[PDB]
Each structure stands twice: as structure tokens, then as C-alpha cells.
Ligand binder design. Sequence first.
Ligand code: PLP
Ligand code: PLP
Lengths: 341, 341
Amino acid sequence: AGVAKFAKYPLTFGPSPISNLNRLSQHLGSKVNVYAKREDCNSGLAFGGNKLRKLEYIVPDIVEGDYTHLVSIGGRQSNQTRMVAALAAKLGKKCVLIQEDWVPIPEAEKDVYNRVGNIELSRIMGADVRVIEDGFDIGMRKSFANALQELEDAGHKPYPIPAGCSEHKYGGLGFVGFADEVINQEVELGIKFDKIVVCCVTGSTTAGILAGMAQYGRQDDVIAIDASFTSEKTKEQTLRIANNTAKLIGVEHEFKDFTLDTRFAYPCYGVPNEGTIEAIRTCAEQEGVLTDPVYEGKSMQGLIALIKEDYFKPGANVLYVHLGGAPALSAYSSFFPTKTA
Amino acid sequence: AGVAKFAKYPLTFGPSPISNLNRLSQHLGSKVNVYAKREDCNSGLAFGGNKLRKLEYIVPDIVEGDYTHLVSIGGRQSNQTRMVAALAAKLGKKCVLIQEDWVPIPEAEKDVYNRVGNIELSRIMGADVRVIEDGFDIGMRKSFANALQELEDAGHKPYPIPAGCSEHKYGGLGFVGFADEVINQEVELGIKFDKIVVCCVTGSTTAGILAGMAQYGRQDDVIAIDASFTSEKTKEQTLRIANNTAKLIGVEHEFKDFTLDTRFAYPCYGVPNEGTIEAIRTCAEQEGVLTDPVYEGKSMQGLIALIKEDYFKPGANVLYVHLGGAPALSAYSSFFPTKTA
Ligand SMILES: *Cc1c(COP(=O)(O)O)cnc(C)c1O
Ligand SMILES: *Cc1c(COP(=O)(O)O)cnc(C)c1O
């Protein structure tokens, strides 16, 4: 057990704060005391987000080697690519982004879904944005490899950074350190978290939290809420990340399965459902905390669905993980009509 | 010297962090050392910002008596209105927001300027968003006074929060604390800031820094960048707010004038110029830090312009203030096209 033996490059202000969503708690029945560890309030690098914690353990490599281009990938409103662009800017490197079509671009948004939001930010930061229309997949894509081959054949030295970092060698280390962090904040705040709720589609964030919590034998505190509607590969990939990461940090524990509620992924990746939107609104109306229609919105409804059904013990302290991703909210404007008054 | 006598309700994580923009500073010929105090990363209340800091000294008054509605006013992509919603949602009060027509909505941005960005956020937080046609003015608005009367007629108890909280009785207290944070942070940093750059439209931000920095006899360290294009009143109100506040905290010194660079407001409030777009792109390409076409993109272009002309002593430590506004960026995608490689 030790993430400390790995090189880390600072890209955040330090330990992400924890918000006490006490008002939302009461509203939901006062059954559980909901808390939120603000990863969305990460750093000053283009709004921040969980993906920034992941990159901290990857940057040292980039810097140590002689690289000129940082290439990543993801869907249109990809949070990843947007943070890879901000990072590339900070390191003074070139940036290439492969924006594939992973979400059935809603009609009433087909004219902005590819111009406004996160994709706009990658542009403003000077990244070679490329709009391809390949299928959705949380695994290695055959457009990422070609981009690499291209820049290489061009005489450039590209740095591969897979979807959400997840499948990167050190993709699970950032959230191992997340675990060490919650453990300390529990003592500083004086509150123990009985459970941890976090969204999941490509893996690393969940896997990292599992392998990292294992350090204190608490992997079972984790509660993942699928948002990829493909629990199939999402659980198997998250599980494989959890193992390869546990090995890296000295954890013996072999992960064979984890809590992966799949009741709110539908209708698919990127497309909210009537429940998602209501969750976002309730969270926002009650706390002033925004959540997106793709990730955190679906994990927030799951958090509310669970609370409704007395899934947690009476008076439980549950740590909701806000991974950010709000900036893509402007590409789903059509789903939030003005509140009747 | 007495901002402590007044009550304060916590709305931010704590004293804002100061980023060291060394890469940008090198880009601008290593003329000075640019630092940026991050008000744009000060809270979890939907992106937070400078207005939230102002509000901390106003919330106590609110909760004390009995008000049911918080009312404020600003343009379509207003930041203040959006932060008032979050404040209201959190305080569990209702929200009525007047969204005047303060900006000539670009032709390309006509089908979005009112459905995306800040406005969308206020709607998700269930605020009563009222899109009005009145024009730009940093002074008390008719639509405002009408709202107070309307709601008050319906048997409600609205709380009046003018534009940017600037004209509020305590709208200046906020940044008088910013001055305190600055001096303390110079100590913890082991360096002294020679000058402070900060955007200025409705007044209270700059006004509070002036009365605060004056506690130590350092008002002349303040350098405001106007983005209203109506210097005359912007300088008139800012100067009045700064004078009232000064008396509240006990500062005798009377402000008769202050540094207000107006070279970058052109062509008008809410609209960037090729220079702004250039600054936003420079800061983003160098630090991965995002600024807005309306306010900060101008404070930033001015900063760059001032450095070039050798306005500061060589090696000076210049504290730029990032007040936020980046969320409104989605309403200007037309201006930022994919850069060529
Ligand atoms: C990228 C992202 C996720 C998914 O993280 P995984 O580690 O890939 O499960 C969830 N929420 C937000 C806001 C994200 O940006
Ligand atoms: C409100 C605001 C300002 C202006 O503040 P004043 O105190 O009115 O000068 C500047 N920048 C941003 C991003 C703002 O939201």
C-alpha cells in the first residue's frame, strides 16, 4: 500500500473540498446526511474535474520524456479532451483531440451540440480538434492509433492518453490518492463516510477509489452508478483497472466484483432520461450545485433513488463524488424549460 | 480597518488561491511576474465568482429578518443573477431575476445567447427568470423597482439585490476583506504585490479593494480595466461606493479619483474586440486558464497591453484578479473557431 512511491505533478489547488449538502438532505427525508467531495472545484485549469486528479500521476512521464503532442479522445462534449487541452497548454505542448460521435445528437440540439460546451473550450485553448463520427466505446478505438501513427510519421513525438485516462498504466493512481485524502478529511472534519457514491463509464475513477479504499479494507464502501448503459464492458474494464492498480500500489486484495447499480444508464450514453433531469433540478434547486445530463446527473438521481428506498442505514453519512462535467450543460439546454414560475 | 465588525455568512471555500502564471509571464517577454487571485474558483455554488464574495456580507441581513424572495438584475448572460439563484436556492428562498437586454446579441449568437450559458443555469436552479427588453445601465433599474412592488403586492417579502450588489449598502465590504487576504497572502508568499489589475463595470469589486488597500495606505496600487464602455458613470459609481464603504470600516482617506484604463471596453459592454479574442486565446494557450469575452477577457487584454508598453517596473509582481465569468463563454462560440495547425 503506497501511491507515494509514484511521481506526481501538481495540477490542483490541493485536497478537493467537501460540501455539506445539508439542505438537500432534509428535502429528501432527512434519512441520510449527504456530503459532496468537490472534484469539480479541482483547479484553475479550465474549470477542473476528476480527470485532473488522474493526470497528476501521468504528467511526470510526459515531462521526463521528449514529447511534443498530447493526443486523447472522447465523445463530442468530452470532459477529458477539454482537460487534456488545458494540460497541454500548461506544459507548453501541442494538443490533438479526436471527438467521436458517441451520443445520438438530440435533434433540438443538433446545431449546438458540436459547437458549444466543452468542445468550444478545447478550441479556445488551441487544440487540434477533429470531429469524427465513429461509434461509442470505452475501450481502445481505431482512430486514436491512426492519429498517433500520423503525427509520428510526421516526425512528431505524440503521447497517448486513452478515453478518460482509464486504460493508461497510471490511470488508476490519482483516485488511489483520492482514497488517502478522504481518510484524512474524515479526521479533520470529524465525520465518517459509510458509503461513497460515484458515476462510472470508463473505469479509473471507480477502480482507483476501490483499490485505494482497499488499503483500509473499505472497498465495500464504494457504490458505482453506471452511466454508459453498457454494464457489460464497464464492469469488466473497471474491475481490470482495479486489479492492475492494486498491484501497483502494493494491495494484495483481488477484486472480483463491485457495486455497479445499472438502473439509471438508459436510454444510453449522453442521453438523459426523465429521472436524470429531475435529479439535476432537485440538486440545483436545493443546493445550488449543478450536475450534467451525461454523468453526474445520472449518478445524482441514483443517489436519490437509493435514498428514497432506505438503502442506507438511518443517519448514514454518504459521500457523493462530484466529478464535475457541468460545462457540457449548455449542449443540453433544450431539456430544462424555465420553471413554471 | 474594521470589516470585522460586520457579520459574514460563509459562501466560499475560504481565502481565494493565487495561481502563478509564470508561463504567460515568460510569453510576455519576462517583463513582470504575473499572479492571478482566483475568485473564479472560490465556491461550489455553481462556478462561484466575485459576486459571491460580495454576497457574504449581505446574507446575514437577509436571514435575520423575514424575506421570501431574493431579487437581483443584470444582462442576459449575467453572472450576478446566476449567483443570486444559487444563493437563494441554498438559503431556501425564492428567486426572481430580471434579465435586461444589455448587449447587442451577435447575429451568429441570436439563437443561443438566451438559451445557453448563465441564463440556463439560473433556470435549472429554478429561479423566476424574466427576459426584459430594457437597455444597459449600471444604475437602479425601473424593471427592478417594479418587481419589488409586484411581489410585495402579492403579499410576499422580497429582498433587493441591485446589479452586481454594487449599490447595496454593504456591497463594498466584500472586497475590503479581499484587501486583507492580499496582505496576509503576501506574507505567506514572502513577496509583495506592486500592482493589482481588476475588471470593473458596476463598481463594488474595485471599490472594496480601494477602501481596503487604503487601510494600509496602498490605494494607488489598484488598477481597474473598464469593460462597460461608459467610463464616466462606471468611474462615478465606483468612486461613490468606495467612499461610503471607507466610512463604514473607519478609513478616513477620501477617494476623489482612481486608475481606470478604458482602452479596451470598445466597442461596447458585452462585445469583445479582436484584441479580447486574442487575449482570451493567449491566456488559454499559455496557462489553460479561461477568461470571458465580456469582462475578464478585456481585463486580460489590457493586462497584456500594459505589460508590452512597459507600464510596470521590471520584475514587478502584478496580481491580476480573475473574477470568473467563464460560464457565459458558451454564448460566444462563433468568435472562437478551431485554430489551424
Ligand atoms: C469523465 C467523467 C466521469 C467518468 O469517469 P470514469 O473514471 O471514466 O468512470 C464521470 N463524471 C464526470 C463529470 C466526468 O467528467
Ligand atoms: C460582476 C463581474 C465583474 C464586475 O464587478 P464590479 O464590482 O461590478 O466592477 C467583473 N467580472 C466578472 C466576471 C463579473 O461577474
